[PDB]
């Protein structure tokens, strides 16, 4: 959301959400891209964000 | 190295920009 | 070895004018003494408020310093005593040095071995034999019993040093420090002057305490003798005085310097009053005041800066504040990549 | 490049204070 | 309510039982089930347990029982005989074993709770051994039966095999401690009960046979229960019980009639709620409403087992049959506890448990109030009744008939019968009951005897409480503000009243040391001190263990000491004791009070000491059962035996004091034998005074012990861990890291978990539990108990060894370091002054 | 999406109470978060070399870790204020899940160490004279003989007992899609190694 | 019979014998069987074999011990009783028991008693040792010890013993230890010239529930009020008695006329109709007091025209213009003002005057330094009593016997006490340890805070 919209410029506290949304990604991606599946733009578990 | 880590731990116990 | 650093709390405000006049007539012509003491009794005025100063001395007088340097001298005779004061000052025809004695026996013939009064801050260095220290401790505890071992509560310490490098509040050492301070305080009459424990520091070096701490002239000093707890006699560290024995010409002790917290706070407040009183002021004047203050501090300490790692951060923060003040003066919106040229 | 005065706590500690003085 | 009070008068209808077992084995949950059965308005929540006896805030947060709780409730029997039960719900943690003993002394029966899946564990063995030592009746309850069904999914034959192995192992354990053959256990004997307190299942063979007889009729439930266990099979061709299997795969009677229906009901409830549960409940006669079938699996299972099994009558009948009432169970209790013995007139009167006899209470617990400023004593009445607002005489642990100094007259205020959460005020409490006495807290410290004043003056005290294990963990405790020093002391007093094994001692340097058994025990002690007793800030030193001192060689030269009177000379030598002899003294295998002819024969037989030399034994030190022995070996023709016997007592006190305060680091002395080789006693009676002999005796003891090669002894804990079979290597690694060696690693029969038994240094056990649980990610759990003193490697008197502060020293540098710092902690001198 | 954890022994010092303790005590579990101190107390953080806390009197064998000061907070550090006591030890829930449906629900899995009923000591117990005095009536049978020992749902019903919170319930209340954190238990547990 | 022939009687040193400490063992911290080693003055676990007292006897070579409770002496290395006349004084130091003949003779004493250290002192006028800067409690306790009837009541134990107590009532601990301290103060054969209230301060802290701590220094008026109210509760059975030793000595009866003042922002007709509505009319309410609180005039806030910076003074009778029908005090509240004029009914035999200092203004607390101008010999309160009760109270003359004075700012101040020796008529001030002989005239030139008056 920070890269797409850049809404953190008008609310810095919103960064707390942004840093979380990236964090969740690291939680999900490395559980997702674990087996034969590798890194790539295919993960679609969008519930957390 | 790791042997001195234990001693260092004992001694320590007793003695603008947006960042995504 | 116990060192007591303290100061007469309100000597300036408690110099009795009649007693001061008598003491001055002792050393100077009675006309001069009367003139000085009468000059110390004038009307203090400020705006709509005015009164008459009849108890303390006025420090704005040009000769007032002399008076202080005389009055404090009397306190020395009350602290050291006539015998020890004469031993320190040497014979009247062969005056001694600042810290020296005519003979070694005179040096070792009294607990008080070093003394310096400065203006109002007295530093005293006692060396106590075990029997003498024990006797002083018992004499102090006779009228000040401490069943709860509460002597450690109010004991001031130099928190700027780490726990191992600080003074260790052992029971016997703290008792000796309290005993020494009480003995010194008993000598001075409570009306002519006074010594307060809270605004004083007593540091003892023994088997328990390897470091001798004190603070003088804005310098936080700690001597750690090479004999006991010197793993390496390093010389690369430039903020460390390497004390030497004049007789053996050998490495015996090691002095660590540090800027006192009060000096750092004074410098910070000076920079603050430079900055805040800089509204309709030229940039050159602000930079000149900053340069003068910085050069004064750095050329006064010159070694205690490097060890005081907090002073470095304070100095760079103050420099950044001054540069930000100049930049805001140039333009309200702060620059992003302002140059240092 | 910012021009900000950076603290030298741990920076430039290798050299003595007698350097570059005569 | 009133029937409960009127039931106390009859001493035959009262059972004083204590529910003891290993940590987290269901004792508290079983008491919760009993409370729910007795109290209609008290029901557990569906998710959270009830934990009725867990009244402390610490217990409800740690999840572990901390203190014993009294529960006095009326329970129906199988026939319906409403008995009165005083249950002592004791903690299962080994560190709180003392808290069991406080409840074990005032109990006539023991209910050993054993987890079905885990089986016999460390604290279980310790508790059965200890209970057998106090000559108490032992009955076993296997709790958590559902773990064989809902967790292991064992076949019913294998579940029976696991239960039989569990019961047979306790039988092989009691035989190691009980000579009486009546202490055998078998569910058909009524000794063994089965239960699952999570789902409110509680049956013995008699109770389940009673259920059968109620369902079908014309069945003798006693005779049926006589054939519901073991290798006995059932033949439906003859409808008869045969010792031989009627068919090829005939299941046993227990499997077919007891385990099979329980397995099937649990399977239907947990798997077939919607399909077959109503049908099987109609078959079993259980009717559940439509809303009661909407509950989740666990509440529904608990409800359906409550309906089918009903009351906990099997537990009641087991306790009634195999645990003596106070009236019949008083005589062994008086013999093992009363110091004057059963032969005494007061002992004979107390053996009858007469409610009209002289008042004789035995307070063993001390419970704090809400505000913590007043303590209520808790004890068993053994003779007579105690009335509210009545002056009584409260003795102490040091009281003797010759010394009325330790007894203070106090007025008994209100009296309560205590049942967990609440207390019912009463006027009088007849003999054989448990009572909370208010107003007698001041003279009581740990354990006291309450009797009547101005009468029954020939009344000694009950024996001081004897604990399973020695407390060796030591923590120094100071106030953050020295101005608040008295409050801490006050708080210290309170914890000393509240923990039976706690030992608060002020040292020479002024440090107040608290003695505890383990990390959790001391953590709870400090929580109680900080939060409810002192209510002040407290500084706690790093935990350390207590050390002892021993010798390994005979003293090189005869060590002599002469009194300041310069008329009495004692020349002594020091020798180490044989292997196991010190343990024999500690275990009270032999006492100094034994007849002297056989006392020497013991050492002549088991240790081949000379009969004359063995008869020369003076006393043990530093206590009556202390592990140090003082032996006379003076030449008969050189020292007058009659004259030497005059100062024998003074030498005994000097020996005891010197052994209690060691010269090395002011600690206990163990495994040392001091031989008196020469005595020169002043012939004048007043020149051999005790005030001169005793310090001289201590000095010569110190000199002989120092000349003999000194060694430091550190406590070694015995640690058993239950971990998955994969985690054994991790436990091995942790123990090897913490200077511990594994003695055994055996699989638990009937469970994948392995039990690893090892010995660890006590001073190296701090954080060992945390290290093991964190490294194994919580799969491995450990319980540590003090086992035995062992010589620490290294020479403790080596002056050349240099100690580096803030470094774990190597092994040869341990014994020296363990001395010096300890001396620094005691305020002693830097080194051992041998010339002193 | 569900970890096959049977009991919360996995969350020994990694649970909510332990993290509250660590935040209150200004330290941090290795896998746990870091917080700004609850109270500054910088002056009291560095106390003087008292005779009580004298290091010359302290025997060091294994350094006191942050976990030790969290496992027993009232024993290992001074001033334990706003601190929480964690659950000591839930009994190890020894649940053995079936790996093949084509196997009886009540089965002696090889994971169980064999009981191995020993016959070294002949177990003797009081049992009456066999098949001579006691006879059951013809109407007396085990309570549930018609009912089978296990159905097809017995293994799955038992495995439902040792299931995460949403899946061990028979009924419940409907939640919002917002209020269901699917990955909440992923970071509540320890980070995977490597 | 080896008793009565001990050789260690010369070993006893009465100088170090301080019994003001708590009677708990210095090693086991056990309050039972407390034994004090007379050679060193340290308490131990108790007499007996393998006991801490026995260990100290065989270690320090100290033989004679005194049992704290039984008041008997023993030799521990041999453990036999000791009976000697010369030891009686020691027991009389530990448990000073006063006979009824001696109790009534304490107010007629004019002899400077001799201690063991030679520091002559007057009984009752004994310095209370400051522990942790709590001189307010020492001053209040000295003032109450100077009261003759209260002292005579507390000098004999059976006066306040064998009274029924509630099971959870720790209030007794405040009254059973006050008697001990008071009989320590009036003991004319003390080993030490001073007395340490350290034992009673523990009971004060425990009973007050952490307030009036030893370390902090609370207000003397508040502590006096709490102590007088607690002693009243501590005496009697489970239900408090109407006439305890505090009610008949300090409590008097006062009448209050509480009239509600109407809000100023009201119409005059509306004001008078509200007055007529009985909502804003006087309501006579009787009450009882332990002390009379005297409000002081506000500081002048300005220099005088002639004598700049003149200390403010007020005559006592101007302060005592309260408690009469003529004068009124507009007591202001955040809700509404009230007109409360007082009227004394029954004057207590001992009247305590608490002068209102340490007033909390809108931003902090400040002391009113106004000097109270009062006589110390003879007054008359007949003008301060209603005509109905003037006949009942034939005596209205009070003499100052005790005076509390606070020196220094309210942030940190010392509490000095001037006590009038009833036997001799002299005035002595005692600030903790320090005792001096201030002239009776110089008593009234102090910033008085609490005073005690005797009607004779
Ligand atoms: O971790 P971040 O710096 O926030 O960037 C991540 C990261 O890229 P980096 O490797 O540069 O850190 C991931 O990549 P890997 O760590 O797995 O290599 C991931 O991409 P993949 O998991 O698909 O490789 C993701 O990318 P996205 O969320 O766009 O799929 C995103 O990279 P960007 O946010 O820079 O695209």
Numbering used by the authors:
A (entry chain A): 585 to 633
B (entry chain G): 241 to 255, 270 to 274
C (entry chain A): 974 to 1314
D (entry chain B): 36 to 57
E (entry chain C): 116 to 951
F (entry chain A): 245 to 438
G (entry chain U): 100 to 555
Paper text:
Here cryo-electron microscopy analyses of human CE pre-B complex and B-like complexes reveal extensive structural similarities with their CI counterparts. The results indicate that the CE and CI spliceosome assembly pathways converge already at the pre-B stage. Add-back experiments using purified CE pre-B complexes, coupled with cryo-electron microscopy, elucidate the order of the extensive remodelling events that accompany the formation of B complexes and B-like complexes. The molecular triggers and roles of B-specific proteins in these rearrangements are also identified.
ATPγS was previously shown to support the formation of human B complexes but prevents their subsequent transformation into activated B (Bact) complexes and/or their dissociation. The cryo-EM structures of the protomers of affinity-purified CE pre-B dimers incubated with 5′ss oligo (designated pre-B5′ss) or with 5′ss oligo plus ATPγS (designated pre-B5′ss+ATPγS) were determined at 4.2 Å and 3.1 Å, resolution, respectively, at their tri-snRNP cores. A single 5′ss oligo is also bound in pre-B5′ss+ATPγS complexes. Notably, the addition of ATPγS or ATP to pre-B5′ss complexes leads to repositioning of the BRR2 helicase domain and to substantial restructuring of other tri-snRNP components. In pre-B5′ss+ATPγS, BRR2 and the tightly bound PRP8 Jab1/MPN domain (PRP8Jab1) undergo a large-scale translocation. Furthermore, in contrast to the situation in the B-like complex, in pre-B5′ss+ATPγS, BRR2NC is in an inactive conformation, in which the separator loop tightly interacts with the Sec63 domain, thereby blocking access of the U4 snRNA to the RNA-binding region of the BRR2NC RecA domains. The U4 snRNA quasi-pseudoknot is dissolved in pre-B5′ss+ATPγS, accompanied by displacement of RBM42 and SNRNP27K, but U4/U6 stem III is still present and, together with the U4 Sm core, adopts a new position. A previous model proposed that dissociation of U4/U6 stem III is the driving force for the substantial restructuring of the tri-snRNP during the formation of human B complexes. Our data indicate that most of these remodelling events do not require disruption of U4/U6 stem III or the formation of an elongated U6/5′ss helix. Instead, U4/U6 stem III is stabilized in pre-B5′ss+ATPγS by both RNA and protein interactions, in particular by the capture of U6 C37 by a newly identified structural element of U2 SF3A1.
